[PDB]
Each structure stands twice: as structure tokens, then as C-alpha cells.
Design an enzyme around this catalytic site. Structure first.
Site, mmCIF file in Angstrom:
data_model
loop_
_atom_site.group_PDB
_atom_site.id
_atom_site.type_symbol
_atom_site.label_atom_id
_atom_site.label_comp_id
_atom_site.label_asym_id
_atom_site.label_seq_id
_atom_site.Cartn_x
_atom_site.Cartn_y
_atom_site.Cartn_z
ATOM 1 N N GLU A 45 -8.318 4.657 9.633
ATOM 2 C CA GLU A 45 -7.691 4.254 8.348
ATOM 3 C C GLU A 45 -9.019 3.887 7.341
ATOM 4 O O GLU A 45 -9.773 3.325 7.997
ATOM 5 C CB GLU A 45 -6.772 3.254 8.373
ATOM 6 C CG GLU A 45 -7.022 1.820 8.541
ATOM 7 C CD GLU A 45 -5.991 0.733 8.490
ATOM 8 O OE1 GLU A 45 -5.160 0.733 9.537
ATOM 9 O OE2 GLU A 45 -5.673 0.327 7.529
ATOM 10 N N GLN A 50 -3.833 3.468 1.366
ATOM 11 C CA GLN A 50 -4.249 3.505 2.860
ATOM 12 C C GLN A 50 -4.345 5.045 3.275
ATOM 13 O O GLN A 50 -3.397 5.671 3.508
ATOM 14 C CB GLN A 50 -3.275 2.945 3.624
ATOM 15 C CG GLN A 50 -3.555 2.672 5.218
ATOM 16 C CD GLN A 50 -2.311 1.857 5.927
ATOM 17 O OE1 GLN A 50 -1.336 2.515 6.020
ATOM 18 N NE2 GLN A 50 -2.873 0.797 6.176
ATOM 19 N N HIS A 63 0.933 -1.275 -0.011
ATOM 20 C CA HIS A 63 -0.026 -0.032 0.102
ATOM 21 C C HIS A 63 0.829 1.497 0.011
ATOM 22 O O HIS A 63 2.227 1.274 0.263
ATOM 23 C CB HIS A 63 -1.059 0.162 1.240
ATOM 24 C CG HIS A 63 -0.416 0.065 2.460
ATOM 25 N ND1 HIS A 63 0.040 -1.214 3.196
ATOM 26 C CD2 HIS A 63 -0.102 1.009 3.557
ATOM 27 C CE1 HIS A 63 0.284 -0.929 4.371
ATOM 28 N NE2 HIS A 63 0.173 0.578 4.625
ATOM 29 N N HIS A 70 3.855 7.132 3.939
ATOM 30 C CA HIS A 70 4.817 6.068 4.015
ATOM 31 C C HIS A 70 4.485 5.327 2.850
ATOM 32 O O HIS A 70 3.327 5.262 2.126
ATOM 33 C CB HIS A 70 4.991 5.361 5.250
ATOM 34 C CG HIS A 70 3.512 4.566 5.649
ATOM 35 N ND1 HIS A 70 2.411 5.413 6.205
ATOM 36 C CD2 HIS A 70 3.016 3.505 5.492
ATOM 37 C CE1 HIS A 70 1.498 4.303 6.500
ATOM 38 N NE2 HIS A 70 1.813 3.121 6.005
ATOM 39 N N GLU A 73 7.354 0.561 5.476
ATOM 40 C CA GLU A 73 6.822 -0.086 6.301
ATOM 41 C C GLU A 73 6.922 -1.963 5.507
ATOM 42 O O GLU A 73 7.055 -1.876 4.406
ATOM 43 C CB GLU A 73 5.221 -0.090 6.424
ATOM 44 C CG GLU A 73 4.292 -1.153 6.868
ATOM 45 C CD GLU A 73 3.035 -0.718 6.992
ATOM 46 O OE1 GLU A 73 2.681 0.236 6.879
ATOM 47 O OE2 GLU A 73 1.951 -1.793 7.033
HETATM 48 C C1 LIG Z 1 -1.665 0.659 10.902
HETATM 49 C C2 LIG Z 1 -1.021 0.936 9.520
HETATM 50 C C3 LIG Z 1 0.088 2.291 9.657
HETATM 51 O O1 LIG Z 1 0.560 2.346 8.448
HETATM 52 S S1 LIG Z 1 -0.126 3.261 10.949
HETATM 53 C C4 LIG Z 1 0.860 4.413 10.221
HETATM 54 C C5 LIG Z 1 1.239 5.629 11.245
HETATM 55 N N1 LIG Z 1 2.344 5.097 12.077
HETATM 56 C C6 LIG Z 1 3.713 5.098 12.007
HETATM 57 O O2 LIG Z 1 4.117 6.053 11.179
HETATM 58 C C7 LIG Z 1 4.626 4.474 12.922
HETATM 59 C C8 LIG Z 1 5.934 4.696 12.664
HETATM 60 N N2 LIG Z 1 6.537 5.917 12.456
HETATM 61 C C9 LIG Z 1 7.228 6.546 13.583
HETATM 62 O O3 LIG Z 1 7.273 5.809 14.548
HETATM 63 C C10 LIG Z 1 7.772 7.786 13.520
HETATM 64 O O4 LIG Z 1 6.913 8.607 12.878
HETATM 65 C C11 LIG Z 1 9.127 8.240 13.099
HETATM 66 C C12 LIG Z 1 9.762 7.260 12.091
HETATM 67 C C13 LIG Z 1 9.666 7.644 14.136
HETATM 68 C C14 LIG Z 1 9.471 9.561 13.258
HETATM 69 O O5 LIG Z 1 9.116 9.989 14.498
HETATM 70 P P1 LIG Z 1 10.101 11.019 15.298
HETATM 71 O O6 LIG Z 1 9.414 10.911 16.869
HETATM 72 O O7 LIG Z 1 11.385 10.990 15.033
HETATM 73 O O8 LIG Z 1 9.255 12.283 14.704
HETATM 74 P P2 LIG Z 1 10.036 13.571 14.126
HETATM 75 O O9 LIG Z 1 9.327 14.645 13.568
HETATM 76 O O10 LIG Z 1 11.192 13.975 15.145
HETATM 77 O O11 LIG Z 1 11.246 13.323 12.998
HETATM 78 C C15 LIG Z 1 12.280 12.719 12.744
HETATM 79 C C16 LIG Z 1 13.002 12.694 11.557
HETATM 80 O O12 LIG Z 1 12.085 11.795 10.465
HETATM 81 C C17 LIG Z 1 11.520 12.627 9.726
HETATM 82 N N3 LIG Z 1 10.066 12.130 9.233
HETATM 83 C C18 LIG Z 1 9.248 11.972 10.223
HETATM 84 N N4 LIG Z 1 8.211 11.230 9.603
HETATM 85 C C19 LIG Z 1 8.633 11.100 8.420
HETATM 86 C C20 LIG Z 1 7.872 10.326 7.106
HETATM 87 N N5 LIG Z 1 6.665 9.852 7.322
HETATM 88 N N6 LIG Z 1 8.784 10.297 5.963
HETATM 89 C C21 LIG Z 1 9.805 10.789 6.099
HETATM 90 N N7 LIG Z 1 10.779 11.326 7.038
HETATM 91 C C22 LIG Z 1 9.822 11.471 8.226
HETATM 92 C C23 LIG Z 1 11.415 14.151 10.313
HETATM 93 O O13 LIG Z 1 11.336 15.005 9.046
HETATM 94 C C24 LIG Z 1 12.766 14.443 11.006
HETATM 95 O O14 LIG Z 1 13.552 14.647 9.903
HETATM 96 P P3 LIG Z 1 14.571 16.259 10.248
HETATM 97 O O15 LIG Z 1 15.206 15.581 11.617
HETATM 98 O O16 LIG Z 1 15.571 15.989 9.139
HETATM 99 O O17 LIG Z 1 13.532 17.259 10.374
HETATM 100 N N8 LIG Z 1 -0.890 -0.090 8.898
HETATM 101 O O18 LIG Z 1 -1.407 -1.025 9.354
HETATM 102 O O19 LIG Z 1 -0.419 -0.216 7.782
HETATM 103 CO CO LIG Z 2 0.541 1.406 6.448
#
Ligand SMILES: CC(C(=O)SCCNC(=O)CCNC(=O)[C@H](O)C(C)(C)COP(=O)(O)OP(=O)(O)OC[C@H]1O[C@@H](n2cnc3c(N)ncnc32)[C@H](O)[C@@H]1OP(=O)(O)O)=[N+]([O-])[O-]
Ligand SMILES: [Co+2]
Ligand SMILES: CC(C(=O)SCCNC(=O)CCNC(=O)[C@H](O)C(C)(C)COP(=O)(O)OP(=O)(O)OC[C@H]1O[C@@H](n2cnc3c(N)ncnc32)[C@H](O)[C@@H]1OP(=O)(O)O)=[N+]([O-])[O-]
Ligand SMILES: [Cl-]
Ligand SMILES: [Cl-]
Ligand SMILES: [Co+2]
Lengths: 144, 144
Positions: free
Chosen positions: A43, A60, A7, A84, A134
Site C-alpha cells: 500500500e 490508498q 480513504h 473500496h 471499510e
Molecule cells: C490494509 C487495508 C486495506 O484496505 S486491505 C484491502 C484488501 N482487503 C480486502 O478487501 C478485504 C475485504 N474483502 C474481502 O474479504 C472480499 O474481497 C470480499 C468482500 C469477501 C469478496 O470476496 P469473495 O471471496 O466473495 O470474492 P468474489 O470474487 O467471489 O465476489 C463475490 C461477489 O462480490 C463482488 N465483489 C468482490 N469484490 C468486490 C469489491 N471490491 N467491490 C464490489 N463488489 C465486489 C463480486 O463481484 C461478486 O459479485 P457477483 O457474485 O455478483 O459476481 N487498510 O488498512 O485500509
Molecule cells: Co482500506
């Protein structure tokens, strides 16, 4: 092995309005909707096609359930858009261990629940040339 | 009709280094590379899967050939990451006219050349909830 694009994760402020956009504009219908309170998202999955590994590819659409969430923070900073990409695999645990052993940060020790009972993990975007990546194994086993 | 996800367009500063990242990390190999001087990109297509409409899904890695280009400007502003998504169709001209008639801005009067002789158009991201959206018809006719 990563065998499909599973996705594209697309962040939006209003799930219902963005869902309707995709329906009205392209004819894409909702395959499934849910809330994932751990991830902090509402979602909608829109199925676009089936894939040669036996799986499928979806859009998604994701609205945050709270500002203090991955999507809530990202929308606040960047506005609506692609958040993502997700690759499908028949064995997320094995593929995540192999990628961990290359020095790419794997965010979970163990895969967590995602859409439709799937098991998911993420790779840190700063290790993936800026793409939050992911890895997902569907709950229902696929026939290629 | 839009019948697949055709590709994910991913902007990068160094095509060769990002290509190697995807090869080393995931085993994705290069399906094709080219330069599109009109669009101002050096591209590599990495095929991830085939699709149920007879087509395929790719990662399209893009390095700008000049700063004064869509990707050059976008990278300067945003850094490396997802730049656009692309949907496949057997008739881009017809689907683009239908979408134009909904008030979504279609950037080209007539589809232009893209990857591997494909014909492509784009929808304005501000009309698509922040997602730059490409429509593509492959040069070789697909068998579902
Ligand atoms: C349920 C489901 C889903 O897809 S749920 C989707 C929502 N969940 C997720 O995204 C979980 C994974 N993501 C995360 O844990 C976090 O968002 C990240 C990877 C750790 C980033 O969290 P942080 O706490 O570090 O956020 P933070 O804003 O501090 O960002 C740290 C660095 O990551 C960059 N960044 C954050 N989100 C980003 C993204 N989506 N893409 C690219 N870069 C990203 C951000 O610009 C910063 O860069 P810079 O330092 O150069 O400005 N599913 O089944 O498929
Ligand atoms: Co996802
Ligand atoms: C060859 C091929 C390809 O895919 S070649 C891919 C490279 N070519 C393209 O992207 C061509 C289509 N894109 C374009 O023509 C332009 O980039 C756009 C749509 C017109 C934007 O150009 P503009 O001259 O308006 O750029 P500009 O920076 O002024 O941006 C106008 C508004 O669009 C937003 N924007 C620009 N690029 C964006 C993107 N990729 N996604 C989301 N929003 C975007 C930008 O942030 C700004 O928002 P803001 O105003 O809220 O800050 N192929 O075969 O598949
Ligand atoms: Cl839940
Ligand atoms: Cl050319
Ligand atoms: Co493209």
C-alpha cells in the site's frame, strides 16, 4: 459514529508507477507505505486533506502481493480502479456491532490491523449496493 | 491545486432506496438533491465531513435519468458501485489546463455545471489507471 471519509482504496497493477502518476499529475506525495501480508497488499497512502473530526483523508493505492488475495482477484476480474471506500470512526468495534445488528454482513468478528496500526473491518459489498465498505479507527486518537 | 477529496460518485439503480440505505445504516442525511439533465443523473449529496481547505466531502449518489447517459451505460455494464472520485480545487480552470498539458485527456474544453452550482470537469479513466476523476470548484468560495 462514522465521522469522515478516511480513504479511497484504489487497486493497481504497479504501485510505483501509480504512485508516480498521482505525484506527477496532482502533486500528491506519499504519506506512508507498507506491506500488509495478511491482506495481501503493498500500500501507499497519499494524504489529500485533514478532516473536521481530527482525522485525515487519503488515497490508498494497493498492489497485490499475491494473486490469491482480495485485490489480486479483483484486479484479475475488473482491471485497475476503485476497489473500496473507507469511513473513519473513533470506535470501529461499536459501529461494527451496530451495523451487524442491522443485518449488513460484517466480515471480521473483531477488527484487524490496517494502515499505520489502524484497526479495520469491512462490510460485504452485496449488502452495500455494490460498494466494498471499510470502517477504520486510527491508531492515534484524533482531536476534532 | 487539488486540496481535498470533494466526493465519491456512487451509481445506483434507485436513488431513494440507496439514500435510505446510507441513512439507516450510517446515519448520513441528505445535504442536497437535484437533477442534472445535461449529465443525465438524479443526485443526492450526503455530507460526511468538512475539510481543512474550507470545503467538505460528500457521497454523491447517482441514479440515471436515461439509459443513454454516462451513469446509465456504466450501471448496465457493471452494476451498482463506485463510479468516480472527485477532487476539489479553488481554480478548476487552471488545474484542468495544467493537467491537459501533461497529456491526460480533459473531457471538457471549459468546466460545466455540477452539484450546487459547482463547476466541474473530468479526466479520462484510461489515462488515470482506471479511475474516472472529476475536478470541482464549489460555487461558494471556501475559507481554509
Ligand atoms: C490494509 C487495508 C486495506 O484496505 S486491505 C484491502 C484488501 N482487503 C480486502 O478487501 C478485504 C475485504 N474483502 C474481502 O474479504 C472480499 O474481497 C470480499 C468482500 C469477501 C469478496 O470476496 P469473495 O471471496 O466473495 O470474492 P468474489 O470474487 O467471489 O465476489 C463475490 C461477489 O462480490 C463482488 N465483489 C468482490 N469484490 C468486490 C469489491 N471490491 N467491490 C464490489 N463488489 C465486489 C463480486 O463481484 C461478486 O459479485 P457477483 O457474485 O455478483 O459476481 N487498510 O488498512 O485500509
Ligand atoms: Co482500506
Ligand atoms: C453532476 C456531477 C457528476 O458527477 S455527473 C457524473 C456522470 N457524468 C460523467 O461521468 C461524465 C464523464 N464521463 C464520461 O463522459 C464518459 O462516461 C466516459 C469517460 C467518456 C466514458 O464514456 P465512453 O463513451 O467512452 O463509454 P465507454 O463505455 O465506451 O468506455 C470507454 C472505456 O472507459 C471505461 N470506463 C467507462 N466509464 C468508466 C468509469 N466510470 N470508470 C472507469 N472506467 C470507465 C470503459 O470500461 C471502457 O473501457 P474498455 O474500453 O477497457 O472496456 N457532479 O456535479 O459531480
Ligand atoms: Cl505485515
Ligand atoms: Cl438541470
Ligand atoms: Co461527481
Amino acid at each position: 459514529s462514522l465521522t469522515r471519509i478516511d480513504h479511497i482504496g484504489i487497486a493497481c497493477h504497479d504501485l510505483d508507477a501509480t504512485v508516480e502518476f498521482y505525484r506527477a499529475t496532482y502533486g500528491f506525495e506519499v504519506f506512508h507505505t507498507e506491506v500488509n501480508e495478511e491482506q495481501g497488499v503493498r500500500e501507499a497512502m497519499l494524504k489529500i486533506n485533514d478532516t473536521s473530526d481530527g482525522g485525515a483523508s487519503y488515497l490508498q493505492l494497493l498492489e497485490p502481493t499475491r494473486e490469491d488475495s482480495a485485490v489480486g482477484k479483483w484486479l484479475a476480474k475488473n482491471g485497475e480502479g476503485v476497489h473500496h471506500i473507507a469511513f473513519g470512526t473513533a470506535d470501529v468495534d461499536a459501529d461494527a456491532a451496530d451495523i451487524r445488528d442491522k443485518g449488513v454482513r460484517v466480515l471480521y468478528d473483531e477488527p484487524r490491523r490496517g494502515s499505520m496500526g489502524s484497526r479495520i473491518t469491512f462490510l460485504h459489498p452485496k449488502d452495500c449496493h455494490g460498494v466494498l465498505t471499510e470502517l477504520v479507527t486510527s491508531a492515534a486518537v484524533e482531536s476534532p
